[PDB]
Symmetry: D3
Subunit: 288 residues, 6 copies
Amino acid sequence: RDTDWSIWSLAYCQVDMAKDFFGGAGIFSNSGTCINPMIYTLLVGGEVGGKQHVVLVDCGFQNDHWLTRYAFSSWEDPKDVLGRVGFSPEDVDTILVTHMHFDHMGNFEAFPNAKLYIQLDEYTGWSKAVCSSHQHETEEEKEWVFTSFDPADLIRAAQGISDGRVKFITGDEEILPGITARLAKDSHTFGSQWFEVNTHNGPFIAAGDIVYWYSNIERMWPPGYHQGNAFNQIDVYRQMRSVVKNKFERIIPGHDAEIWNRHNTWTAPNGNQIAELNLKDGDTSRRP
Amino acid sequence: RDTDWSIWSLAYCQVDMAKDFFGGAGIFSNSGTCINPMIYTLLVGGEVGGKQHVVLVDCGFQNDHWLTRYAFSSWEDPKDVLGRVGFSPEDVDTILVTHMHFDHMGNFEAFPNAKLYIQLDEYTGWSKAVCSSHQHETEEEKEWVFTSFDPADLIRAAQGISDGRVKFITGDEEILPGITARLAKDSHTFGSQWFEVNTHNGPFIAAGDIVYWYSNIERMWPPGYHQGNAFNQIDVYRQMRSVVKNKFERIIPGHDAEIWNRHNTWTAPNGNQIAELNLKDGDTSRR
Amino acid sequence: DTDWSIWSLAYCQVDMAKDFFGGAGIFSNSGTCINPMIYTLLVGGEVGGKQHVVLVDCGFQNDHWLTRYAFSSWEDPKDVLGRVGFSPEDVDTILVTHMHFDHMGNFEAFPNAKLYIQLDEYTGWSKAVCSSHQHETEEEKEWVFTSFDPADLIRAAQGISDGRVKFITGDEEILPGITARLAKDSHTFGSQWFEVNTHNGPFIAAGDIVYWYSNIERMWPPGYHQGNAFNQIDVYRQMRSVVKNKFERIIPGHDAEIWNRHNTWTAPNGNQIAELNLKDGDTSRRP
Amino acid sequence: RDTDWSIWSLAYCQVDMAKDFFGGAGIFSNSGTCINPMIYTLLVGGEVGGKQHVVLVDCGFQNDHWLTRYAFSSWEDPKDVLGRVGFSPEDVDTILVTHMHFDHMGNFEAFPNAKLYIQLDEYTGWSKAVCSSHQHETEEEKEWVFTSFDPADLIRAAQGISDGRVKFITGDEEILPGITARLAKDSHTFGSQWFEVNTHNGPFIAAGDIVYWYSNIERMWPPGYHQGNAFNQIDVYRQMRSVVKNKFERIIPGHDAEIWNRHNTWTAPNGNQIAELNLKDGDTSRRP
Amino acid sequence: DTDWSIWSLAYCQVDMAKDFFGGAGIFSNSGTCINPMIYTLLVGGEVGGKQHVVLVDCGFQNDHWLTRYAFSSWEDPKDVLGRVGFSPEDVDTILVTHMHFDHMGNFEAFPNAKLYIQLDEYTGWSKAVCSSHQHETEEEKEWVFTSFDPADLIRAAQGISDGRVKFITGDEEILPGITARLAKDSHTFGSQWFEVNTHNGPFIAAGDIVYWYSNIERMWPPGYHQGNAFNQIDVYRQMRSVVKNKFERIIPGHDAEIWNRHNTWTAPNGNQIAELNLKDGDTSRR
Amino acid sequence: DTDWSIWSLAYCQVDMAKDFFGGAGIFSNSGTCINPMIYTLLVGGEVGGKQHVVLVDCGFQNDHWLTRYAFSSWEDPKDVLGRVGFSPEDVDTILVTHMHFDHMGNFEAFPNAKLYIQLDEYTGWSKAVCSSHQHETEEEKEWVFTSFDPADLIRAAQGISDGRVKFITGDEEILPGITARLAKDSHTFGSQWFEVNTHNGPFIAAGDIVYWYSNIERMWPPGYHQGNAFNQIDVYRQMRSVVKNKFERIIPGHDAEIWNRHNTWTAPNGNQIAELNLKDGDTSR
Ligand SMILES: [Zn+2]
Ligand SMILES: [Zn+2]
Ligand SMILES: [Zn+2]
Ligand SMILES: [Zn+2]
Ligand SMILES: [Zn+2]
Ligand SMILES: [Zn+2]
Ligand SMILES: [Zn+2]
Ligand SMILES: [Zn+2]
Ligand SMILES: [Zn+2]
Ligand SMILES: [Zn+2]
Ligand SMILES: [Zn+2]
Ligand SMILES: [Zn+2]
């Protein structure tokens, strides 16, 4: 089947963060701070002459308590972030979840028509991890387990499973035409997955937090904060490099402001960026 | 290492059901119906000279929509059922869940001080199965998986996990002094577990639905309705027989009125039975 | 590439409680009914090349099994296969869905045929028979042997020594256009079903994984089986996907409804004969 | 200690055989032939003061075509072999099968009251191997598979399974009081097992054909003919040496005339040997 | 029936950023500090008698590794062992927690010592070193080799050939009262920790699974490591359980706090020395 | 679309008991015979692509091993490869069937070649070497080291760090038309054989899983091996299936019968040269 997809990376928030957090405890230690985007990626396309899908890789978090747990700024609603590219949250039929951290699957219920795809190992891993954490007597002992995980997202996932809106992927699978989910077990998280997007202009990768920063995969240096196996990430980087033949601009990192320096980018009134990574044959640009 | 436990099996409801359902196709086919008890079991004890635990194996379902999906009668609140043996739901500190069928974990939020114990395979099995079933285009194609399973219990399970009130068992484990949980993978359900209870009068077994009826384990004949592997149940029957040295009255089946005929039993006003299976050193009977 | 013509032939009939085949809930206490005992003949293979004459299963012999259960109208392979223009000597390969007596019993009646069975089926029954002899009484073994003849374990071993039995381990395209599919712990330890590719699309020989169309149409496994009910659910879905929900393309094991869904002749006696596919020039063997 | 066993190794036949077969292709190539005993081992005992079991480790082959496929001589019936130590074949309640080669299980039906214990992997291994062999067009291509295996023993085993005479062991198991079966997967054969026998004078090992000759385990040099994994045999030798704390005479090899030099031995009229390896407490010697 | 004398000796020091050892987030952009390089001497065994001289880890040689990091105060083993009454050649056994340069580099300075290391540790590094060489530039290889010397792969092989090294595969009580604990994919592919059963309770040589006491106390894996963050969390719980949450009975890899909570006395260059347990019938040391 | 020229080059000869190579049963007490020591030259790859020059195995050096067995006629890689128009410097790839001394001992004579080994072979020998040193005497270690030199373990680790050795894990097409097939616990822990696809059909470099044509023709594994005899049986079946029972298409490890099945000529000292295949557009010798 021939597939083609338009791809936009949309900032919906910003975080000021220690560099070693994203870039590595070695190379980026004691290197000050910087602003990094909170991003989700819109994909529109599919089989040519077939159903057109409106897909989000990840969907941001909500305007809730998480805004106080880190140095966030410039948060924007899905109505506004997607409106600037000519869509609405109602139009989104699928959310592909790289991992169940709060900033990639929180707020999925703002897309009432979307089905959620999660790796089974991600869901089961977090169920066990959350349950195990309650053997510690204080919350200080639980802090690391919950640094990026909202137990309420466990409840929402179960609610979606029973509702029929959450679907499990187990391993690798072409879930939409030209989008292949790749399980990276115990990489960034228990069941992090990345996505291979095949377009007429070649492959693109939505890496999730497996690749926080381009420097992670270019320097082969896993981040200072992650909740998996650093050597597994090494293995995944090599898989990703092979898919895109080291055309590093084709990989979408999770939280790297460097992405705006590498693609046709314009900014919204508040500053949040929009990137036009690719346009399928016959589509028009969204720059004002 | 010296454990001792008092054991009461208490009926909270009754169901009229075709016999082959519980007893088996072929041998009990076209045998009409009979009343069968809906049961949970109270265990009080632990290490002699130690903390006396108050534990439930299973806790029944709520008087909700489930009362109409089967021929139930005489449903009773846990306050009424445990009161007859001298306890209240607030006393229950542990609920041992044999499996996640609605009638064994439905009403657990009625015991606000209790921790829930479930096999990881039971929880993960149902998460996968519920999700897989929503790939069917019609609701009729989904009936069989949900005949005994309430997706609302999946949600309550997830809520208790994050609350810290639900704990996973993975395999065999002595979770309380003298009570060891036994994983029976893919027997009655994905992660059914049974419980071995060690007292001064020897072992007792809480079997759950692996053994619906004594005849399941006496005739080695699995039921006409189950959601796991029939030959796995046979193997579990053999383990149970070995633990109990073939003294069958020492096994507590899930839904067999025959239990009231094998132990010291009396009736409540509405009819629900209270079987006293064992009394630990120093306890007086509650007839 | 490949094409095959297909006939399903009865060789006996069985009167059985409906809950046996259809489910303990929905078909309980529904009386009894007549069900065909069937094996399926396939003739063909690759288009320009060796024509194979194949049986899926081969029925049982007229021995003590006629007094077991309640059979009637039993017929010899010489009679059943002659009506379609063949003799028992023509069959070069018999595909065994599982080692229950009525699907592999009479295999020595086809002297030129190689028998194909899943390694897990043979190993499972070897273990199960041996394990059952841990029970001291014959009554405790009844369920293991409800459908299994220990003499067929010996005949199977005799055939292994003869080179007449071949093991399949998992999925395999055995003959041209016929893929065996292992369904581990489905009806039995190593049940397998067969995907048959013709010019008119695919056909499925389901064995007893699907006793009745109602099993797979309602997604409701039978009341009697010796495997895992949820595994059967998974297989039902695999089969539906292969056949694009064109259910008449699935050959159930023991369902009179197949005579209502296909060109079906009838024999001098009651046992039926049903055409399912005729690949170009296979003159219909319909009178 | 609460268990005790008397132990006799009894030769029932003799075989003239090339030395490299039993001792190894390195040291014993082109080294001629020698006479080697065909042996099964009688164990009498159990719980001290409780049931006196009568046990055979292996039971030899029958007087059939096998007598011509090798240089056999002096085959003797179980009535005569066991008669010399004061027992009859009807006394044997248990036959422990090291492996299903013809000379270790061929004759089990001459012991009408005995249950056979066989490793599940041994039975399934031979079932597969026999069935696979019939893909070869000539009987010569099957010859190695059948050098020590009789397909008729497959049928007899299936018959014993159906009768309730055959019991499967899967892995390690204390089968009788003081006798533990040890699975040695893929050693001499698919499911070879050896037996540790606890006596008041310490442990004895019935090695089956894992140890043909003392030299295999003393020199750590597996034989030239076997149907398993040579390095697996190396690993089992180490387990055996450790159990007997390097008392090599406590190990009963399958086919070594050297055993008559290491134990109190006398001979029958035809030359077949009797070795009294151990006499449990209270037991009297059987030497004439 | 089993007793052990236990000494933790600092053979060197490093000035390192805090998030490296303590964790990103709670120690991000928090500056740096001096941290010790230690190996742990245990001598004793079955109270019956046979006394073994065992080292947990054995430092790194004084070579190019001294310039790769803010090292100082590197001392010889004969120097450091002498201050507690021993000579390298006395060591019977070197228990290797993992194959990073600074726990395995100088094992040849102990000609009598058998080396015990996990099969997965050795096998994982063989795999990794080989995998890295499909990277064309040296910058891409940097992280794999931050703590690993390819020359230690060649020594290990030479040790295998010589009979100096033996592979553990799983848990195994390697010497009377010392249980080796496989922690697959913790700090490294096959890191392991050791559970020393002394008459005065239990002791844990943590290796680099626990860089700092605060990794286990704050349940917070470090910012640099080369295995599985959640696996470390689960080993933290296995350790906490073995010592009943008495954290001092765990010896971290590179925490100067260990000097603070155990009898310590500086040496000439300052490299500390702490005695954690002297087996009754054993003589102390300054 | 692949094509390869194939030469089997004897670089040495060994006088050995027949049962060693042929079997403890059939060839017992059968005396000895001369057997070739062989490595195979492969030149080709994808048609229209980078033509590779590859060695399957590379022999051992003229060192202590020349005295550990009845060897004769040892020749250098410079001489043996010189006769077919190449030098050791041309070989960029050596595919190693197993780590026995006579198949990897001399790989450093090929300074530009990458070495490919099964991971299970390397870890297998690493473990076995360590386990062997638990025995207190050297006679108890002899069988483990009959064909294995611990110096090759050290040379292997050095190449690992140097970047010259690569691990294969299971089956893999390493070069165009060459598939490595792991045969776990066959001749050794991680023995591998190679399927070579040419325009004239498939050829197999069997290593020592097949010492002699009679192993696979008689389905009778050898009297000396360090793996699992029934695994070799199953591997024999895979090989026979690939070549559709054309046994001359299988390259055995040590069988002089090979010179009788192909265009063969001899060197001055006696060592044989076998031209098994010439890819489209090639001239003989
Ligand atoms: Zn994240
Ligand atoms: Zn993120
Ligand atoms: Zn139930
Ligand atoms: Zn129930
Ligand atoms: Zn059936
Ligand atoms: Zn049937
Ligand atoms: Zn044998
Ligand atoms: Zn033998
Ligand atoms: Zn370190
Ligand atoms: Zn380290
Ligand atoms: Zn070799
Ligand atoms: Zn060789």
